[PDB]
Design a protein around this ligand. Sequence first.
Ligand SMILES: [Cl-]
Length: 293
Amino acid sequence: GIGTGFPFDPHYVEVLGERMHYVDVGPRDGTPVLFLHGNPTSSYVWRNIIPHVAPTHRCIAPDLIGMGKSDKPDLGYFFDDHVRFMDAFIEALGLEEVVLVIHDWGSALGFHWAKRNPERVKGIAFMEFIRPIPTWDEWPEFARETFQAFRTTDVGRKLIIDHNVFIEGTLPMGVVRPLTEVEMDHYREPFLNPVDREPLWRFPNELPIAGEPANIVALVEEYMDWLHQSPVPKLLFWGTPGVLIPPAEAARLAKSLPNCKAVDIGPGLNLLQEDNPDLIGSEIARWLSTLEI
Ligand SMILES: [Cl-]
């Protein structure tokens, strides 16, 4: 079965006065592979993909500030807060050229960082990523009224902060196969205290949906304009029905994005890592062997 353990030794680096945790495995030399998770996950979401890559490539998988085993400073945990901390994490580790493997809000971080530093990005593997959602009709019907309620300070915060709905309900509803109790407890562990759940609510409130919020929309539009032009090698994974990326959108992108190979992982919602980690991991490793890295 799909692995439920997290056997990686912890590593910590001081970033802007805060401790960030990260996985670091594989060989020391060579170009590293940087895995960025999203909401409401951690490096745990990469636990079954990394072992396919670590035999031949360094794997670095940080927990976003306020998440995983990283410190939990009193921040609003806006997308800009994560930008600041990931910028500084990358520089605190002395990384120069990287390959990015990115998902959900980690894709927004990685795409925004690659757009600003394209000479340092030798390839991007991405899946279920942040794109402008033009209208709410383009958000999955089965999740629409809930994500709309998420984006309020009254009902949204009762659900996410007080009742932990993003972990207890949204997370399983983003995975086609059933999550075991051991996996749920891994995803629950950073957020046992309700006050620590601010990131889980601020993230859906930053999602670029129907032109809101306007700053995030413009930021994501900018890196999508870069991605439609850039020659950077691209690997897109997609599932059916998907959540952020339905199969029709994955189809368009495979055709339009330059140097982009698309891989159908089968059934999948948002956490595609949890539905087909062996295909995702084995395809990242094969794709990497084709890169000039
Ligand atoms: Cl979100």
